[PDB]
Ligand SMILES: O=C(O)CCCC[C@@H]1SC[C@@H]2NC(=O)N[C@@H]21
């Protein structure tokens with residue numbers, strides 16, 4: 289449903305190394321849509337690993353808007369692994385929590401799509 | 409200094425709480441441009457606070473493309489604080505869109521040029537003083 | 540072998556909640572022993588989760604000594620999950636392995652201490 | 663004030679490089695004492711940088727005990743910078759961070775850190 293989806297934008301290395309390395313990428317979701325606002329934003333940073341068991345392996349930082357007095361506890365950290373179900377990255381991915389990451393990788397390095405979190 | 413400029417894109421909370429809280433935001437740079445490619449990407453996550461000396465306080469994650477055997481050491485973590493220079497150091501009387509929008513510098517001397525849009529987008533250019 | 544063993548010390552919550560929650564803990568290794576010195580230290584922060592397949596799930600920060608010009612790239616971050624080889628005190632006490640093949644030997648004491656030895660498969 | 667202090671233990675590089683690099687260290691506090699229990703633990707990882715304005719610069723991870731369903735939101739991250747009141751002798755003493763929290767530490771000759779922590783926030 290519309291209510292559960294949030295806009296994402298990011299960037300990826302559109303000319304990765306050819307030495308066996310992964311493809312670096314990152315993206316952001318701000319947790320506001322027309323339905324809800326959690327006053328927070330998550331960024332995922334990680335890499336795409338191609339081949340027989342393709343994955344996007346990430347670490348993330350989730351910052352909430354806080355008063356100055358609460359800033360010390362503004363940021364959560366964690367790690368999400370995505371499995372699928374430029375060409376490599378583009379498609380629909382799910383993580384270990386059941387969240388859905390729908391993304392288009394542009395030839396130029398853009399990532400654009402939607403994120404639906406299974407948790408809140 | 410074209411060789412040292414990179415595209416950025418991100419998101420922010422375009423309707424922040426009115427309980428005195430900051431405004432959550434984040435953005436990404438992939439470290440490839442038409443001249444150079446570090447095979448890496450940084451994301452910054454943090455919050456904007458307006459006022460007399462506008463500030464964006466962030467933590468960041470810098471992931472390099474690695475082999476699977478080196479993946480354990482793929483990700484650096486750190487923290488940058490940005491202060492505003494253009495159009496001024498102050499948020500200047502406008503909301504989070506206007507307060508965020510402009511040119512900023514961090515403690516390393518890197519330059520963050522950003523335009524914040526009414527429906528949550530951040531679009532700009534980043535230049536790093538280190539790397 | 541000896542060359543790859545390092546002293547570890549840490550703390551845990553010796554009176555965790557009895558509401559389905561895990562048990563908070565953390566520990567430190569400085570990567571100096573009598574055979575080598577990497578001029579760095581890792582801390583692991585996480586929780587012990589009990590049951591038929593007990594787990595210690597952690598995130599870590601590995602800081603190297605750097606010059607001030609390189610301090611921006613001093614700290615790696617990552618995550619290790621430990622499973623046990625062969626109360627929270629008894630739960631944590633023993634020998635553990637992570638997804639890298641590293642070995643974690645620890646005694647958790649009634650007063651909240653963690654004392655042991657770490658061997659890294661990649662460090 | 664016993665009621666506001668928590669036991670810490672950690673390790674540090676007791677033979678750092680002599681090339682101007684800082685001294686790596688880390689420590690842990692479990693947030694349980696005889697008076698209070700937050701069911702959480704913080705680890706600080708960082709480096710001591712000596713000189714006339716010595717500092718211990720850290721990043722930290724604060725993990726709370728959670729149910730499995732809440733584990734995704736178990737761990738806070740941040741950064742504290744410590745200044746010393748008035749590298750073994752370097753580290754040993756009393757330090758305060760930007761929040762006014764107090765870090766009291768003895769550095770042992772072979773790499774141990776032992777002391778107390780008091781947080782000005784909670
Ligand atoms: O609670 C909030 O402030 C907004 C929702 C955050 C959901 C987080 S983002 C990191 C993690 N991975 C997911 O798929 N969901 C959670």
Ligand SMILES: O=C(O)CCCC[C@@H]1SC[C@@H]2NC(=O)N[C@@H]21
Nearest residue numbers: 439446448450516518536538539
């Ligand atoms: O070395 C790389 O892989 C690319 C350059 C990274 C520069 C980093 S991003 C985090 C920190 N903040 C800056 O302004 N620059 C450094």
Ligand SMILES: O=C(O)CCCC[C@@H]1SC[C@@H]2NC(=O)N[C@@H]21
Nearest residue numbers: 570577579581599639641659662
């Ligand atoms: O390279 C170094 O500076 C020291 C060795 C570090 C090994 C790290 S600690 C985090 C991760 N978990 C392990 O078991 N090994 C690596």
Ligand SMILES: O=C(O)CCCC[C@@H]1SC[C@@H]2NC(=O)N[C@@H]21
Nearest residue numbers: 693700702704761763781783784
């Ligand atoms: O809230 C808790 O779970 C226990 C107190 C945590 C206080 C934290 S530790 C990191 C940061 N630095 C401080 O000096 N205090 C806060």
